[PDB]
Design a protein around this ligand. Sequence first.
Ligand SMILES: CCCCCCCCC/C=C\CCCCC(=O)O[C@@H](COC(=O)CCCCCC/C=C/CCCCCCCCC)COP(=O)(O)OC[C@H](O)CO
Lengths: 14, 11, 236
Amino acid sequence: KENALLRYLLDKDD
Amino acid sequence: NALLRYLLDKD
Amino acid sequence: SIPHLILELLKCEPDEPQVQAKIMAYLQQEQANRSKLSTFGLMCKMADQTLFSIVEWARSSIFFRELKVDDQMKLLQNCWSELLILDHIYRQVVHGKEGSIFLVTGQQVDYSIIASQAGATLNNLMSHAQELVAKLRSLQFDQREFVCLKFLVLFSLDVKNLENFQLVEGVQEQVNAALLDYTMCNYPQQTEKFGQLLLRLPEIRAISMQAEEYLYYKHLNGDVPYNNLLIEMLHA
Ligand SMILES: CCCCCCCCC/C=C\CCCCC(=O)O[C@@H](COC(=O)CCCCCC/C=C/CCCCCCCCC)COP(=O)(O)OC[C@H](O)CO
């Protein structure tokens, strides 16, 4: 939701 | 759980 | 005579030979930046690659493919460790032997290479797994039965906050019923086959609980590599 990687980067911890 | 979401949404 | 459903699920099975070459390939490609990790640290690396592999298997699998990502996450967050355990167990039955563990990368490894440097926690765990692997050799556990167990594991009815719950039960009861037919048709003189298979599920659940606690311990003891997937899964 909003380009996987991008979201993973915003959300991911650390 | 960002990583798991990524793996299912990725490519 | 393999039921209708089992044949479908049976086609979602990844290319076993291909996965070994790839995970093996990654472990090597990774190796290239330290003039380093221990045996354990390497096994971790191999394990979370097995995880990436499993998630892809579920993601493009009959039925699972139709769940909202939120449901997909809830189911996998609930059975990831048990899917990995079932996976490793089925591998020992199909390829394993005597006093030798068959790794996901394709190589056999005498038990002594593992036993030599193993502590108390890991010992209980490796022993429980052994007992289970043997119980399954004893039942002549096959691939048809294997994929059924995987779906019964994936589509658990113990996971809450599930939106499309009605679909989970569908497959649960459906795969359950397929297995019920399969065993009575392919193994008539062994009416207990069905039951023994279903009773391994609780065992796979237990071993996997233990494996997570043991892995959390290793991570707290600073034994686990910087942020691998498994640890990111345990965080939840
Ligand atoms: C056998 C069933 C799995 C056992 C480990 C389960 C939880 C952990 C899963 C991922 C890590 C596996 C670690 C395997 C052992 C390992 O890498 O390192 C060991 C040494 O190396 C060897 O024994 C030699 C290598 C051993 C090869 C083992 C082959 C099987 C590994 C994969 C199993 C399938 C994936 C399971 C994933 C489950 C979720 C984590 C560590 O012994 P130690 O930790 O100090 O005991 C401490 C003690 O328990 C302090 O008291």
